[PDB]
Amino acid sequence: VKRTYQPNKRKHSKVHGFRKRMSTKNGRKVLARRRRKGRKVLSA
Amino acid sequence: AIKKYKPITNGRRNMTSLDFAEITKTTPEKSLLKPLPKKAGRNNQGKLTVRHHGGGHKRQYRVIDFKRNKDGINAKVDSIQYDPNRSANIALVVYADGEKRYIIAPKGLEVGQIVESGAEADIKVGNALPLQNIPVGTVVHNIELKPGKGGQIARSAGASAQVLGKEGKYVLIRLRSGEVRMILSTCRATIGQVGNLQHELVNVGKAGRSRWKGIRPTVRGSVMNPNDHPHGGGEGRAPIGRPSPMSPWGKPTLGKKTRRGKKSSDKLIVRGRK
RNA sequence: GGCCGGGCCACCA
RNA sequence: UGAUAUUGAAAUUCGGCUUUCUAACCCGCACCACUUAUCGUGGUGGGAGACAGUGUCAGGCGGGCAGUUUGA
RNA sequence: UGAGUAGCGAAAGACGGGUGAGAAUCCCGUCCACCGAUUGACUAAGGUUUCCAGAGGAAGGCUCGUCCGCUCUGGGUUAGUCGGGUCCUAAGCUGAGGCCGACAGGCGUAGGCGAUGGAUAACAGGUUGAUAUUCCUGUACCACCUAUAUCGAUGGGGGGACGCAGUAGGAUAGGCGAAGCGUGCGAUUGGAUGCACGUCUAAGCAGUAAGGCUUAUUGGCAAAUCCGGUAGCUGAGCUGUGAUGGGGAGAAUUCGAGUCGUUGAUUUCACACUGCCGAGAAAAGCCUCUAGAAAUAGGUGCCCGUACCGCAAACCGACACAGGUAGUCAAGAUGAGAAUUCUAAGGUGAGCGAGCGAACUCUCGUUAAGGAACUCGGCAAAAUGACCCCGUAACUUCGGGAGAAGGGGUGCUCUUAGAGCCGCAGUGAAUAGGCCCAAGCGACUGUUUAUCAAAAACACAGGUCUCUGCUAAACCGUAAGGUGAUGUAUAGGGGCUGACGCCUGCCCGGUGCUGGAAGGUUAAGAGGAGUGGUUGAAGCUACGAAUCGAAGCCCCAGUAAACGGCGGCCUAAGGUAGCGAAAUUCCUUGUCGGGUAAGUUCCGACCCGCACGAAAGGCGUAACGAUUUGGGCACUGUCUCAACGAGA
RNA sequence: CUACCCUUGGUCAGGUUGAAGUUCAGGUAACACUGAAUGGAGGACCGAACCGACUUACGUUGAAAAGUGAGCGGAUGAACU
RNA sequence: AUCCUGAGUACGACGGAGCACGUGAAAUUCCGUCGGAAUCUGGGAGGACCAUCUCCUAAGGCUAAAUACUCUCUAGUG
Ligand SMILES: [K+]
Ligand SMILES: [K+]
Ligand SMILES: [K+]
Ligand SMILES: [K+]
Ligand SMILES: [K+]
Ligand SMILES: [K+]
Ligand SMILES: [Mg+2]
Ligand SMILES: [Mg+2]
Ligand SMILES: [Mg+2]
Ligand SMILES: [Mg+2]
Ligand SMILES: [Mg+2]
Ligand SMILES: [Mg+2]
Ligand SMILES: [Mg+2]
Ligand SMILES: [Mg+2]
Ligand SMILES: [Mg+2]
Ligand SMILES: [Mg+2]
Ligand SMILES: [Mg+2]
Ligand SMILES: [Mg+2]
Ligand SMILES: [Mg+2]
Ligand SMILES: [Mg+2]
Ligand SMILES: [Mg+2]
Ligand SMILES: [Mg+2]
Ligand SMILES: [Mg+2]
Ligand SMILES: [Mg+2]
Ligand SMILES: [Mg+2]
Ligand SMILES: [Mg+2]
Ligand SMILES: [Mg+2]
Ligand SMILES: [Mg+2]
Ligand SMILES: [Mg+2]
Ligand SMILES: [Mg+2]
Ligand SMILES: [Mg+2]
Ligand SMILES: [Mg+2]
Ligand SMILES: [Mg+2]
Ligand SMILES: [Mg+2]
Ligand SMILES: [Mg+2]
Ligand SMILES: [Mg+2]
Ligand SMILES: [Mg+2]
Ligand SMILES: [Mg+2]
Ligand SMILES: [Mg+2]
Ligand SMILES: [Mg+2]
Ligand SMILES: [Mg+2]
Ligand SMILES: [Mg+2]
Ligand SMILES: [Mg+2]
Ligand SMILES: [Mg+2]
Ligand SMILES: [Mg+2]
Ligand SMILES: [Mg+2]
Ligand SMILES: [Mg+2]
Ligand SMILES: [Mg+2]
Ligand SMILES: [Mg+2]
Ligand SMILES: [Mg+2]
Ligand SMILES: [Mg+2]
Ligand SMILES: [Mg+2]
Ligand SMILES: [Mg+2]
Ligand SMILES: [Mg+2]
Ligand SMILES: [Mg+2]
Ligand SMILES: [Mg+2]
Ligand SMILES: [Mg+2]
Ligand SMILES: [Mg+2]
Ligand SMILES: [Mg+2]
Ligand SMILES: [Mg+2]
Ligand SMILES: [Mg+2]
Ligand SMILES: [Mg+2]
Ligand SMILES: [Mg+2]
Ligand SMILES: [Mg+2]
Ligand SMILES: [Mg+2]
Ligand SMILES: [Mg+2]
Ligand SMILES: [Mg+2]
Ligand SMILES: [Mg+2]
Ligand SMILES: [Mg+2]
Ligand SMILES: [Mg+2]
Ligand SMILES: [Mg+2]
Ligand SMILES: [Mg+2]
Ligand SMILES: [Mg+2]
Ligand SMILES: [Mg+2]
Ligand SMILES: [Mg+2]
Ligand SMILES: [Mg+2]
Ligand SMILES: [Mg+2]
Ligand SMILES: [Mg+2]
Ligand SMILES: [Mg+2]
């Protein structure tokens, strides 16, 4: 049966990518939180 | 006239349609078309704000000359055409200088007939004049509310209004709804009645034919749940169960008037209707 | 309780 | 829905009422320019006009929505 | 611990030979078997090295393992023309200025980004362990540059440029046949001398082509010789060349033939033509107008992707998981068919086996006599079934019902519809409607509780009420800005009803809605008579009645396809038509009749309607239904009543 | 994923039925009207692909956190993708 | 004390907020709306308010230190 995750490079980059995060204040808050926690990966 | 289909199927039973015998040309005029993507009742927020809109056939917009501001030049009617965007047919008119325009097709307008607009135009069907120069008792359509803005009243199939009198800078008109109101004397109107009178006679016949027109199904409030509608809930079928029938947004919806107060047009509306 | 001829208004031991 | 501010000039009639005016304010009206632009701003006409809209105050309606109560 | 227990994930393997310390499990061979509108071939997404070679066998692999999509080491993806960028726009996103907003921000103009669409120059053959329209060979094309002898729009106009169905044709691909020509083979099982295949070759460049379509003067911001007004272009395919090249059934690097018939597209001409209503993108490339201001030869041509899996062992499902995953190619026999069965191309034998042939479970086949007696219920199974020809009821909205029902035929051989031949049986396998009578509900096709409900529920076409005069009403939003609508009362929103037919009664007292009267009542505000405190007073200060003062509410009227109500003298009025033990009836298995040997269910009546009733519609109604309910024929292991056989 | 929607693409073996129109032959003062032919309409019929999910059997420490087998509904449309 | 000394200001009504303080005998501070002074014989406060007395001189601005914290750095401690 069809499952929830149907991968799509373009969709993934456009919704969760770096530039989409930079595009809003709350996305920049996400990036700041992840930098503060010390994550290796900040976004897609 | 109206075509009555034979009941070859349960869907075709009692279905009728226009025969399109007044349509003299079956394709539009290319230079006057414009794209018209569907909104499906969704506004600039992307949110549905009007229910029951969506789907339906693809349509191209026909640019219609509602203003009729090309004064002093004759125009010959070249063809009567189907317009998917409105109930009336439209007429392609060719001006004496070669300019081609679309106008609402009046009842009785014929190919080869000459229409003209302006203060000096004759009182004949398809001619557009200011209300100042239109005699009392004349049946008109495509009436402007503001000078130069273009006709806004009496534009659908079979629509008409009659001139009643002249009181100063306003002209008294009885509209198709039955309302009697004043309109500025410099506002233009076109002589005659809008054509395609049989438009309201069509028996749609089946649900799918409504779907082709972009109408999505209406769900009654009585079969919703209380969190969806004031009429929702109850065990089994239920009556209204409150003093007044209600809209889905919680407002009385049988007889309650909604015209707002203190409008600038109150002074201009002499007798109302609907 | 207020006011007017029962009706409107008012009432935070 | 009322008062008041924005809000100005004349009259008629009984602190008001009414009518007229234009110049505030308004126009999802027309044309013009910026400008290859159905936004905007400015200009000129037209319409409307001390109304409307908006602020503050006040009365009314208000399961549309909300916080809760509904004893032993 | 349970326990050496459950399981080891859809299936056909056998043997020989090899390798090895070790082999059902690896390699090779032969035979057998499975898929084949696909278990074959090729694209896309997604994955991201899983690809190739050599070496390995700790762990992973549901067993084994010498093997591997696992481990180690070394390798592998080649483009002016393929797909994308240096081209175009759609939805949508964004947005200089701008509009709006406690902040944060929201919206939006020009503009921009953005394919799933438009434009756009390369084909055939060969070659590797792993790449190929990319490398090589052959033959091309496109853009730009140079060398040797009118151009014109970030302007106008045209064009690009478009739905759905159906029909008749042209051509071609492909299929089949004869063997015309060629290439192999001619067989120790009784016979014959016949059996088995091949029959190709691109872009490009020339030529050809069935077909298909069809002069003057004066608004497109200035001008136009263009467009608008007025008084020939396209086109599948063919032929030659490309190519004495290449490939070839085969034979010994050399040689080796490319034809006749038939059928004929789902491909193409081509959305060409015809018809229809629901009326079917944009922009650039391109052509042209105006303002305005050659061939030939040689050379140059960038970036990104390119391995491999890809209807899966590599993607989504935690798995080497019976699931999910867009498009394309579409052989033969049979047939209407892409159904069915067997095959071709090509792929595959399923990552535990060996025995045995107990109970019991599951899947499958048969069954004496009977034939629904089973059971809540014929649940399941059985029966029906294709094609051709007869024949076909009530009812009906005249379409239908209808494939009603019910019958008949079918093999093979020969002769020109007959004559024969064989079997138990001839659509001899596989696949292919069970039907009829009656009632309830809903008109109908459709929709629904992803994952216990598919329905009588929702929707629906139709009806009616109501709102709405356009900056409409309604709706989203604080606003700006939007939807409604580039619509305008034959339109748009909301309520209820639910095809159609015949109809839809009584009550406006109450509530809601609509309109009237400005009589009573009321707030802010105005208006200030008067009074207290303090300083005989002003004065400062705390309060304070006349009266003016809106809507609402009270009052009056109307309105029931508004909310509602439809008696037991009382009311506002006391239920019309139709229907009725009903999807409604407690008593109740009401009573009577029909149907059965027997009928709490069913059908027809009665009316005593606990507690039907007219758009939360009444009563009917052809057609329709994986709906509910009763009856009947067929048929059967459902049952009497169980028996045997096959496999897991 | 799922619901609705927007833009732009794609897909639907075969068989059956036979609406409107048109032509002819009648018929008529004219028009109705009749018969044949043709024509090819439909949320039309049967039925693969495809989309569903009515019954039943199996599965229920599953092959599968919703499936499989056998039938079953739709299958040019309010279709599916 | 001849002139100057912060005006839509102080202040008031209504609605709110901040003050320990819930509008209360509520002074004192601020905001919106509307109104709106006095001018050294002036003005403000001393918890309603008035008079006297006392203290001060709003409606312009600037100002170290004592105080708060530790991602850090240096040296140490339990
Ligand atoms: K119409
Ligand atoms: K490659
Ligand atoms: K009543
Ligand atoms: K009433
Ligand atoms: K009864
Ligand atoms: K009842
Ligand atoms: Mg609607
Ligand atoms: Mg509905
Ligand atoms: Mg419900
Ligand atoms: Mg509610
Ligand atoms: Mg209710
Ligand atoms: Mg009920
Ligand atoms: Mg008001
Ligand atoms: Mg509540
Ligand atoms: Mg709480
Ligand atoms: Mg208790
Ligand atoms: Mg154990
Ligand atoms: Mg054991
Ligand atoms: Mg045990
Ligand atoms: Mg055991
Ligand atoms: Mg076992
Ligand atoms: Mg296995
Ligand atoms: Mg087979
Ligand atoms: Mg490998
Ligand atoms: Mg192992
Ligand atoms: Mg490896
Ligand atoms: Mg924006
Ligand atoms: Mg702002
Ligand atoms: Mg593309
Ligand atoms: Mg390869
Ligand atoms: Mg077009
Ligand atoms: Mg054709
Ligand atoms: Mg085919
Ligand atoms: Mg078509
Ligand atoms: Mg490859
Ligand atoms: Mg693999
Ligand atoms: Mg396996
Ligand atoms: Mg799998
Ligand atoms: Mg799968
Ligand atoms: Mg076929
Ligand atoms: Mg098959
Ligand atoms: Mg038997
Ligand atoms: Mg027997
Ligand atoms: Mg029998
Ligand atoms: Mg029985
Ligand atoms: Mg029994
Ligand atoms: Mg059954
Ligand atoms: Mg058959
Ligand atoms: Mg026979
Ligand atoms: Mg139904
Ligand atoms: Mg159905
Ligand atoms: Mg369910
Ligand atoms: Mg349950
Ligand atoms: Mg179900
Ligand atoms: Mg709009
Ligand atoms: Mg209903
Ligand atoms: Mg009903
Ligand atoms: Mg009634
Ligand atoms: Mg009344
Ligand atoms: Mg009042
Ligand atoms: Mg008052
Ligand atoms: Mg009872
Ligand atoms: Mg019986
Ligand atoms: Mg009965
Ligand atoms: Mg009822
Ligand atoms: Mg009713
Ligand atoms: Mg049976
Ligand atoms: Mg296909
Ligand atoms: Mg159908
Ligand atoms: Mg699929
Ligand atoms: Mg479903
Ligand atoms: Mg199935
Ligand atoms: Mg059916
Ligand atoms: Mg079907
Ligand atoms: Mg000072
Ligand atoms: Mg406070
Ligand atoms: Mg204070
Ligand atoms: Mg205080
Ligand atoms: Mg003070």
What is the residue-wise DSSP string for A1-44? ---S----HHHHHHHHSHHHHHTSHHHHHHHHHHHHHT-S----
Nearest CA among B146, B147, B101, B104 for reference residue B126: B104
Q: Give the domain-ending residue among B176, B194, B212.
A: B194
Measure CA B14 to chain center: 26
Residues B102 and B135 in one domain: no
Q: How many CA atoms lie within 13 A of B148 on its CB side?
A: 0
Q: How many CA atoms lie within 13 A of B196 on its CB side?
A: 23
Whether any strand D atom is under 7 angstroms from the Cβ of B250: the reply reads yes
CB B40 within 8 A of CB B56: no
Residues B166 and B181 in one domain: yes
Gap between the Cα atoms of B91 and B76, Å rounded: 10
* B242 φ, ψ (degrees, to nearest 5): -145, 170
B252 CA to F47 C1', in Å?
53
B237 CA to E580 C1', in Å?
22
Nearest CA among B234, B149, B231, B229 for reference residue B189: B149
Going through B68-191 in order, the beta strands assigned E by DSSP cover 75-81, 90-95, 100-104, 114-115, 128-130, 139-141, 143-144, 151-153, 161-167, 170-174, 180-184, 188-191
Gap between the Cα atoms of B166 and B163, Å rounded: 9
Number of domains in chain B: 3
Kind plus residue range of the DSSP H or E element containing B35: strand B33-35
DSSP assigned state of B11: T
Residues B15 and B104 in one domain: yes
Measure CA B195 to chain center: 11
Domain assignment of residue B188, given as a range: 117-194
Ligand 53 mean position, distance from CA B231 (Å): 28
Mapped onto helix, strand or coil, the DSSP state of residue B18 is strand
CB B118 within 8 A of CB B148: no
Method of determination is cryo-EM
Gap between the Cα atoms of B133 and B24, Å rounded: 32
Q: Which residues contact B153 (CB under 8 A, 6 or more apart)?
A: B142, B143, B144, B145, B161, B175
> Widest CA span of chain A, in angstroms?
40
Mapped onto helix, strand or coil, the DSSP state of residue B152 is strand
Residues B83 and B135 in one domain: no
Residues B106 and B41 in one domain: yes
Burial class (CB in 10 A: 0-12, 13-18, 19+), B62: buried
Whether any strand D atom is under 7 angstroms from the Cβ of B261: the reply reads yes
Looking at the DSSP bridge assignments, the partners of residue B103 are B91
**Long-range contacts at B246-249 (CB < 8 A, ≥ 24 apart):** B246/B221, B248/B221
**Torsion B108-B114-B118-B120 (CA) sign:** negative
DSSP assigned state of B82: -
In this structure, how many other beta carbons lie within 10 angstroms of the beta carbon of residue B259?
9
In this structure, how many other beta carbons lie within 10 angstroms of the beta carbon of residue B168?
7
CATH number of the domain that B28 lies in?
Answer: 2.40.50.140
The closest ligand to the CA of B10 turns out to be 69
Q: CA-based angle A25:A29:A35, to the nearest 5?
A: 140
CB A35 within 8 A of CB A42: yes
Burial code (b: 16+ CB inside 10 Å, e: under 16) for B105-132 equals bbbebeeebebbbbeebeeebbbbbbbe
Gap between the Cα atoms of B224 and B217, Å rounded: 14
Residues B154 and B204 in one domain: no
CB A44 within 8 A of CB A18: yes
Q: What are the domain boundaries of chain A?
A: 1-44
Gap between the Cα atoms of B183 and B235, Å rounded: 54
Gap between the Cα atoms of B115 and B25, Å rounded: 19
Sole residue written with tokens 């049989």: B198
Q: Considering only residues 35-94 of protein chain B, which place a Cβ less than 7 A from any atom of strand F? A: 37-40, 42, 48, 54-56, 58
Which amino acid appears at position B100 of this protein?
A: K
In this structure, how many other beta carbons lie within 10 angstroms of the beta carbon of residue B79?
18
Phi-psi region of B233 (alpha: psi -120 to 50; beta: other; left: phi over 0): left
- Sequence length of chain B is 274
* B108 φ, ψ (degrees, to nearest 5): 85, -5
DSSP assigned state of B263: -
**Torsion B42-B47-B53-B54 (CA) sign:** positive
Q: First-to-last CA distance in chain B?
A: 29
Q: Which residues contact B100 (CB under 8 A, 6 or more apart)?
A: B29, B31, B32, B78, B92, B93, B94
Gap between the Cα atoms of B107 and B59, Å rounded: 24
Gap between the Cα atoms of B142 and B106, Å rounded: 10
Q: CA Rg, chain A, in Å? A: 13
Q: Which CATH architecture has domain A1-44?
A: Orthogonal Bundle (1.10)
Ligand 25 mean position, distance from CA B25 (Å): 81
Q: Give the domain-ending residue among B113, B144, B162.
A: B113
Structure token digits, residue B121: 């135009």
CB B196 within 8 A of CB B141: no
Kind plus residue range of the DSSP H or E element containing B210: helix B207-212
Q: Give the domain-ending residue among B177, B194, B211.
A: B194
